[PDB]
């Protein structure tokens with residue numbers, strides 16, 4: 001259940017994230033910030049409404065969405081995208097679309113921690129998050 005993803009999570013490990021950002025076309029300024037920020041990810045749900053808030057000194061982002069409904073997302077790197085979030089096959093899937101390109105971030109609960117995987121054109125990433133308190 002999506003509720004099982006609720007809570008404040010802290011990043012304990014990252015992998016492939018720098019390759020992904022490169023794949024998107026993000027420059028060093030943001031690539032360095034992302035590569036060195038150890039953000040907190042707060043996920044809360046209300047029925048079908050869902051909010052994902054990212055917090056760090058180097059950056060703070062946040063967006064809300066209703067499962068199954070498309071919406072305009074202003075990504076941390078400045079992209080406006082047509083995002084849809086849908087909880088399917090036991091994971092939260094955040095599919096993005098912009099300028100003919102696509103990308104999807106998948107968040108799932110595993111062994112007690114939140115495992116976030118991002119993919120774009122076969123280039124992927126894997127961030128592990130442990131619940132705070």
Ligand SMILES: CCCCCCCCCCCCCCCC(=O)O
Nearest residue numbers: 030033034059076077105116118127
């Ligand atoms: C932290 C911001 C760094 C700037 C680069 C942002 C690149 C956009 C990344 C968007 C995808 C983020 C999803 C990664 C998964 C996660 O939430 O940790």
